[PDB]
Write a protein that binds this DNA or RNA. Structure first.
Lengths: 96, 115, 87, 137, 61
RNA sequence: UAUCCUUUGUUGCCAGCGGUCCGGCCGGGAACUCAAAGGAGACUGCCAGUGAUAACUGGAGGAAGGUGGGGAUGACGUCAAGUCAUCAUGGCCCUUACGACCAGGGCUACACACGUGCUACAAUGGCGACUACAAAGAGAAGCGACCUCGCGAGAGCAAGCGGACCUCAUAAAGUGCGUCGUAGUCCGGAUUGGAGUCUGCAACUCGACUCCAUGAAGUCGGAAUCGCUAGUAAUCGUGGAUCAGAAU
């Protein structure tokens, strides 16, 4: 019963890592509760597009912090061995 | 009623009425009524002769009127007689420029004004 | 009108030590050469001696004096006041 | 009555209907105390007296703009009657809000004032150009 | 100043070696210095913009 | 962005049950809200009228209908439009100096004139105490709980978070209660005197802010002219980018 929340800024690097975390644990251990999205806290900025005049412009910007659950139950010795060894994603912060 | 030096606050609360004094304000208005034991929601026309008496004697011990205005005049006179620009600023009858203001400055002043 | 902008001038050779004496109160009269410096808080209560060009005169700085230069309290010329010179 | 529900809205400034209905019903109360008549009846008559029948419009017919008399629609007579009553009330000099409405609803029944002057002025503009009546429209 | 910068004096007074403080090398300000550079917050900036400080660069957003 | 469904849930909620210092808080469970992804959905098809047709008008069904609502996007070309001080570039021109360093001075100088803005005159109001709801945002030397000192700004001490779990926060109007009477006034705040805080190396022409004192003009405005058709006008307050700090 090990829950793994995977968070990051880039949406893709997460799907890659999260998917790997699952696929690898799909063999040695349980099928995992399956990778999920969860609520993503968004941070947006609204600054002027053009440096002058056109006051009526200032576009919208956003930096999202995506999350994941995965959650792997019924962990076996090899279930963890497949985790500790392989770790690619760098923009992904793991929390087991 | 009359309290300090020349002041006639009429038809108003004991607080706002005293606020019309050059010396005391809101902060002093509350503290004085609390020290003399007077209701702040009572009109000046409802105050007894005994309440006003205790109000005059206490508010009496304070600084106000002319004697204070002379202290101000003296303060402005001391730096005025000296070589301080601030004092000359108080007069402002001095040269604002860069040419001479003493004489030959009618091109900006206009017709000669009386001394 | 005076002038400052945002660069008040205080000679470092009369602003750092004056802060030293602030270690535990103040220190006996001091002597500075550059009267160009302007008076400020810290210098209050202390007795600085300005150079008239001949000697150093003791100028007891006060809060009311803050803002003016040390030279303003150190007269250059010397007028006797040929008379009873009273008050 | 929907008329009263509509009159309470024009007096609703900033969305304060709770206070609005407070001044309205307080006016009808003092209205029955000052006048021996039902507050409702005295209300309707007040709005009926303030309504125009024929309005003259300006139209360019060939050379110049002629003033042609035309009939008014029943949907605008209700709005104007309501609007001109509240504006005239805010014109009175009595501090009491509910009192300004009670007196206005009474004087409106008696008939006399500025609102009446405008009624006569419009009535005069009409018939004065009866030579343009054949353009009933 | 020249008197306050007694720090230059390797041997401290009655106080233990801990007495030795810092003082900026350029301006000589004890308020806010940066050990690594030995310069104060005011000098590190002026020296930074000039580019006289090697490896140092202004952070961007 | 508006309705619905499928996948998923440490956000959510006795919706349902149990415990409850009755705070989802806990047990617990995913319904609901929400978060994310994919998908479903309008197309004049149906009804009546008119018409050669297209199509127009009315109507039912329906969450939304006739491009449902808001973005990005701007044709061949025009003004020889703006910028060679963003940068690149042809020609031209200077290379002890139209190069460089340093100290000290202004752009915020005024009798006036103009443009663009701000603050105004109250009781469908102002003030004091108490008290109820929001969204979107920001935080490493930074946001700063809590405590203590000060009328206050602020200062000393100091927990927690790195942050949809700690903080900035108190939302304001609103609601309940009490107070003020029409006078230049408890309207309005200019100006000026005194004291002080904060940023900054350093604020006497050039700061912002706090407290006390002072407290003007102004009681709604001569000739013209400007902004808008729905949650929009109008009105009220809040966070952010730039950023040590003059944004009304």
């Amino acid at each position: 019963r090990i829950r793994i929340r995977l968070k990051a800024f880039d949406h893709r690097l997460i799907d890659q890592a999260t998917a790997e975390i699952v696929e690898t644990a799909k063999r040695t251990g349980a099928q995992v509760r399956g990778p999920i999205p969860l609520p993503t806290r968004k941070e947006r900025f609204t600054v002027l597009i053009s440096p002058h005049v056109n006051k009526d412009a200032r576009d919208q910007y956003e930096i999202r912090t995506h999350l994941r659950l995965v959650d792997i139950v019924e962990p076996t010795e090899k279930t963890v061995d497949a985790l500790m060894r392989l770790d690619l994603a760098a923009g992904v912060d793991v929390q087991i | 009623a009359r309290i300090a030096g020349i002041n006639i606050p009429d038809h108003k609360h004991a607080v706002i009425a005293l606020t019309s004094i050059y010396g005391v304000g809101k902060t002093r208005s509350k503290a004085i009524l609390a020290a003399a034991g007077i209701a702040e929601d009572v009109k000046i026309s409802e105050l007894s002769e005994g309440q006003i008496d205790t109000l005059r004697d206490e508010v009496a011990k304070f600084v106000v009127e002319g004697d204070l205005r002379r202290e101000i005049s003296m303060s402005i006179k001391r730096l005025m007689d000296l070589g301080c620009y601030r004092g000359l600023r108080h007069r402002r009858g001095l040269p604002v420029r860069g040419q001479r203001t003493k004489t030959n400055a009618r091109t900006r002043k206009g017709p000669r004004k009386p001394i | 009108p005076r002038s400052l902008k945002k660069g008040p001038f205080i000679d470092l050779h009369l602003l750092k030590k004056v802060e030293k004496a602030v270690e535990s109160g103040d220190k006996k009269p001091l002597r500075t050469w550059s009267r160009r410096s302007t008076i400020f808080p810290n210098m209050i209560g202390l007795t600085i001696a300005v150079h008239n060009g001949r000697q150093h005169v003791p100028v007891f700085v006060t809060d009311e004096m803050v803002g003016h230069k040390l030279g303003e309290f150190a007269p250059t010329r010397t007028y006797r006041g040929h008379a009873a010179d009273k008050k | 009555s929907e008329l009263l529900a509509k009159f309470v809205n024009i007096l609703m400034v900033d969305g304060k209907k709770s206070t609005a209905e407070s001044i309205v019903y307080s006016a009808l109360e003092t209205l029955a105390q000052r006048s021996g008549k039902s507050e409702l009846e005295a209300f309707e008559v007040a709005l009926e007296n303030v309504r125009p029948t024929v309005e003259v419009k300006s139209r360019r017919v060939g050379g110049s703009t002629y003033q042609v008399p035309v009939e008014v629609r029943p949907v605008r007579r209700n709005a104007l009657a309501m609007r001109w009553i509240v504006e005239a009330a805010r014109k009175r000099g009595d501090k009491s809000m509910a009192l300004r409405l009670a007196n206005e609803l009474s004087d409106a029944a008696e008939n006399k004032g500025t609102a009446v002057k405008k009624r006569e002025d419009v009535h005069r503009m009409a018939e004065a150009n009866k030579a343009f009546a054949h353009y009933r429209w | 100043r020249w008197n306050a910068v007694l720090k230059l004096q390797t041997l401290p007074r009655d106080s233990s070696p801990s007495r030795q403080r810092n003082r900026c090398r350029q301006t000589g300000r004890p308020h806010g210095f940066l050990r690594k550079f030995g310069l104060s917050r005011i000098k590190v900036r002026e020296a930074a913009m000039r580019g006289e400080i090697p490896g140092l660069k202004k952070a961007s957003w």
